[PDB]
Structure formats: C-alpha cells, structure tokens
C-alpha cells in the first residue's frame with residue numbers, strides 16, 4: 103500500500119529486534135516503556151555530547167510525479183527529562199531521505215553536520231524541533247522554542263516555549279499535521295494541566311523532500327537532559343490528491 | 346485578562362444556569378453529560394427542521410488595532426448520532442460576533458440565513474463544519490465532508506469525510522488550531538480505532554471577524570440525526586504578537 107497507519111499506545115513491549123518496526127541509530131536505545139534518544143550512565147543520568155535517532159523502519163510515501171501526495175498526522179507523548187535549568191539541546195520529529203543517518207550532536211539535534219547546517223542546498227530534511235538551548239551562533243531566538251526547520255538548523259518559523267514547560271520534565275503530548283493540498287505543517291504541543299502551543303507554517307514537502315522518506319525522532323545533547331518517547335501514532339492519507 | 350483557558354472534561358455537571366458558563370440558543374439544550382444541539386422527542390429520537398447553538402458565555406478576544414492577536418487551540422469530543430444513512434445536516438464549531446444568534450436550520454447549520462448564505466459581504470462568521478448532507482444547490486462536494494467556512498456556507502476548502510465515519514455514530518475527537526502569526530486554521534478529526542482527517546487553510550481572522558467574538562457549537566437538521574458535545578477545551582495565547 104501507499105499510505106501508513108500505526109499506533110504504539112506505550113512501548114512496554116521492549117523486546118522487538120532493532121530494525122524490524124523501529125530502527126535505532128547512534129546513541130538511541132530501546133528501554134522498557136520508551137524509546138530513549140541519547141545516552142545515559144547506569145543511574146539514568148544524562149551523558150554530555152550525544153546524538154541518537156529512533157525512526158520507523160518502513161519507508162513512508164510522500165508524493166509522486168502523478169500529483170498524488172500524502173497528508174499526514176502523527177501524535178506522540180514524550181518526557182524530556184531535565185536535571186537542572188537550563189539544559190541542552192532538545193529533540194525533533196523529522197522526515198528525511200530513507201538512506202540518511204544520525205549526524206552531529208549538540209544544537210544540530212542529530213540532524214545536521216556542523217559544516218553545512220545553515221546551507222539549505224546541502225540538506226534534505228524537514229523537522230519540528232523542540233529546542234531547549236539558545237545557540238546564539240545559529241540564530242536561535244532568545245528563549246526555549248518550538249521551531250519548523252526546512253533544510254537547515256535555522257528555523258523558518260518558531261514560537262516561544264516557556265521555561266517552565268521546556269525545563270519542567272512533565273509528559274507532553276504533541277500533534278503534528280501536514281495538509282498536502284494546502285502545503286501546511288501544524289504543530290500542537292499540550293501539557294495536561296497547562297498550556298498549549300501552536301505553530302503552523304506553509305511548506306511544500308514535495309518541493310523539499312524525495313518521494314519516499316524515513317520518519318522518526320532525533321535528539322542531540324548537550325547536558326543535563328535526556329528525552330524518552332512514550333507513545334507514537336502515525337496516519338497518512340492520499341485524500342484529495344486525485345486519489 | 347485578554348486570553349481564555351477552560352476545560353470541561355465531560356458535562357456530567359448539568360446543573361449550571363443558562364448563560365453563566367455556556368449559553369444555549371434555539372433548540373440546543375443542556376442534558377446530563379452533554380450539550381445537545383438540536384431537538385429530540387421523549388425517546389431521544391431526532392426531530393426534523395431544527396437548529397441550536399451552545400456557545401461559551403464570555404466574549405473571546407481575537408485581535409486589536411495594536412497588532413496583538415490571539416492564537417488558539419480548542420478540542421472537543423462529540424457524538425453525532427445517526428438513525429440511518431444518510432442523515433442531515435451536520436454540526437459546526439464557530440466564531441461569530443458577540444451579539445449574533447442562531448439562524449436557519451437545515452444545511453445552513455444554524456449559522457446562516459437562507460437569503461444571504463452565499464454572500465460573503467452579508468456575513469461575519471468563520472466555522473469549521475462537519476457536513477453530513479450534500480446540498481447540491483449550495484455547492485457541497487459530492488460526499489460527506491469537513492469544511493472551513495469563511496462568511497458563507499460555500500466552504501473555502503473541504504476534505505472528504507468517509508460515509509462510515511460520518512454516519513457511524515462513534516465518539517470522535519476534534520482539534521482545531523489557529524496560528525495568529527501565519528494566519529493558518531487547522532482541523533484534525535480523529536476516531537479512536539479509525540482514521541484521522543486533516544484540513545488546513547490560510548485565513549486571517551483579523552480581516553474577517555471583529556476584535557471580540559463568541560465561540561461555540563452550532564447545528565442544523567435535517568433528519569435522523571442529533572449531535573451531542575461531550576467535552577470541550579479552549580486555550581488562547583497572544584504569543585508572538587508583540588505580547
């Protein structure tokens with residue numbers, strides 16, 4: 103088939119082999135109940151300078167020459183665990199080529215190589231980043247932020263993420279949707295007894311990514327921080343693109 | 346304050362007086378556990394030709410002359426109960442002037458008056474409609490659909506709603522978000538063991554609605570159908586509009 107539909111309500115079924123449903127790259131590992139993105143020592147304490155990725159194993163169809171394009175929705179809950187405030191560097195949900203791998207740690211979030219990070223012509227990746235560190239040198243806004251990245255670590259759009267939520271270590275729920283007809287990517291982040299965060303931007307995936315992509319989570323540290331993905335749902339539809 | 350934040354996890358607290366938290370107009374009524382939008386007989390059986398609205402009682406700030414504009418997110422679960430297939434006419438989440446009231450029933454969904462429904466200059470309303478009836482005469486697409494309505498019942502954009510979901514009578518969860526910086530309205534509709542529906546469109550609320558609006562649910566019937574709203578959450582933020 104050309105569309106994908108999966109739901110993982112939790113990850114307490116930690117015994118699946120690497121690469122069969124989810125592929126782990128770099129320092130990302132499967133633990134009981136979670137996809138862990140960067141490295142921790144014996145006590146679950148975060149290591150500095152680490153990067154990892156957990157991605158769905160199958161390729162995801164996005165578009166083809168015949169006009170058919172996939173609209174999609176993904177939701178996931180995560181626990182960004184902080185051991186002080188501030189922490190570094192964050193996490194990201196991404197869509198990249200099937201053949202790509204984890205790249206640099208720190209503020210590049212395992213998605214970019216330091217040398218070509220601010221160069222759109224040298225990257226093929228769209229990511230929604232949940233940034234905990236202000237990298238002054240790569241144009242981060244002066245606060246923790248949520249951002250949409252298109253072929254570069256310098257986000258095409260961002261919205262403020264409050265300190266209390268960014269460094270509070272509570273489980274958060276994210277909803278990311280893409281409408282393939284109007285080329286709109288929307289991010290919704292919610293905290294159970296807190297506030298919501300909304301960020302939407304026009305981006306034509308067909309114009310920046312290949313026809314088939316790999317989807318997943320990528321993180322880069324940094325220090326005093328580690329991200330655990332607790333559940334994940336992905337659904338894509340070709341609705342309205344003549345199919 | 347200029348922003349709104351409320352959460353109703355369920356409506357089993359049916360004893361609040363009309364107009365204090367929620368205002369009921371037309372045939373909409375408060376019942377144990379739900380906001381009922383149109384009329385039913387003794388047995389909960391749907392009446393033909395009815396319209397009703399349940400709206401938040403306080404005015405909601407949307408924008409002002411000084412550039413400040415509200416981004417928002419609302420979520421709600423609803424049960425669109427069907428007594429056969431097809432049914433008519435649907436429901437809608439809307440934003441209208443504080444002083445407006447319920448209008449015609451049938452395909453106008455309590456939001457428009459038959460005479461001026463296809464005339465944008467005569468209406469001030471933005472609505473996300475969940476349309477169960479194909480009104481050939483008002484340009485409905487040839488299937489049940491979800492649509493975004495801007496000052497007219499003829500939607501500026503729509504996406505297919507499958508027959509099985511539109512007439513299946515299962516509880517569905519909706520997420521509607523508006524980003525005031527990029528002027529994007531997104532609708533996400535999810536069924537627990539089913540599919541998701543995504544529809545997003547650029548619409549500048551500041552350009553079509555007054556500075557303060559009333560928000561709520563509106564329905565119009567039709568026949569063999571009745572909608573119950575089971576929970577409702579609304580959150581708005583001025584984030585990124587210099588405030």
Ligand SMILES: CO[C@@H]1O[C@H](CO)[C@@H](O[C@@H]2O[C@@H](C)[C@@H](O)[C@@H](O)[C@@H]2O)[C@H](O[C@@H]2O[C@H](CO)[C@H](O)[C@H](O)[C@H]2O[C@@H]2O[C@@H](C)[C@@H](O)[C@@H](O)[C@@H]2O)[C@H]1NC(C)=O
Pocket residue numbers: 150151152190191207208209210216235237239240323324325
């Ligand atoms: C003078 O540069 C600073 O040098 C140290 C040692 O090389 C860097 O910090 C170490 O490596 C980081 C990746 C991170 O694991 C950190 O905990 C560790 O001490 C430092 O990098 C910046 O550290 C920040 C946290 O204090 C944060 O993680 C930033 O993302 C990180 O900057 C990124 O990574 C560095 C190595 C460069 O590639 C930068 O272009 C990039 O933004 C160094 N700071 C600077 C400004 O480079």
Ligand SMILES: CO[C@@H]1O[C@H](CO)[C@@H](O[C@@H]2O[C@@H](C)[C@@H](O)[C@@H](O)[C@@H]2O)[C@H](O[C@@H]2O[C@H](CO)[C@H](O)[C@H](O)[C@H]2O[C@@H]2O[C@@H](C)[C@@H](O)[C@@H](O)[C@@H]2O)[C@H]1NC(C)=O
Pocket residue numbers: 393394395433434450451452453459478480482483566567568
């Ligand atoms: C010839 O027109 C048809 O006449 C009947 C009686 O006046 C209309 O049906 C009744 O009223 C409806 C509002 C609804 O309560 C229905 O159950 C009831 O029998 C009929 O209206 C259309 O009925 C459809 C369901 O069979 C559906 O509800 C449509 O939304 C409704 O059309 C709307 O309402 C009518 C009254 C007009 O204002 C239309 O412009 C509008 O789309 C009439 N059909 C038509 C095509 O008008």
Ligand SMILES: *[C@@H]1O[C@H](CO)[C@@H](O[C@@H]2O[C@H](CO)[C@@H](O)[C@H](O)[C@H]2NC(C)=O)[C@H](O[C@@H]2O[C@@H](C)[C@@H](O)[C@@H](O)[C@@H]2O)[C@H]1NC(C)=O
Pocket residue numbers: 120121125126127128129130131201202203204
């Ligand atoms: C899970 O399976 C992957 C293969 O599909 C592993 O990645 C591959 O690991 C090789 C080194 O063992 C490396 O040469 C390959 O290029 C790499 N594949 C990609 C796309 O990068 C993966 O290995 C982890 O991630 C790689 C990038 C290295 O950092 C390894 O040290 C890691 O083990 C496997 N993960 C695990 C936990 O087994």
Ligand SMILES: *[C@@H]1O[C@H](CO)[C@@H](O[C@@H]2O[C@H](CO)[C@@H](O)[C@H](O)[C@H]2NC(C)=O)[C@H](O[C@@H]2O[C@@H](C)[C@@H](O)[C@@H](O)[C@@H]2O)[C@H]1NC(C)=O
Pocket residue numbers: 363364368369370371372373374444445446447
């Ligand atoms: C809940 O309180 C509302 C007042 O804030 C009622 O609406 C008002 O009802 C008057 C008739 O009793 C009418 O003249 C007013 O114009 C109307 N207000 C608006 C904004 O329309 C509301 O009444 C229901 O809805 C109105 C439109 C009529 O259809 C009434 O018959 C309904 O009772 C009150 N709802 C209930 C259930 O009490």
Ligand SMILES: [Ca+2]
Pocket residue numbers: 191209233234235236237242
């Ligand atoms: Ca950063």
Ligand SMILES: [Ca+2]
Pocket residue numbers: 434452476477478479480485
């Ligand atoms: Ca209709």
Ligand SMILES: [Mn+2]
Pocket residue numbers: 231233242243247249255257
């Ligand atoms: Mn950033």
Ligand SMILES: [Mn+2]
Pocket residue numbers: 474476485486490492498500
């Ligand atoms: Mn319609």
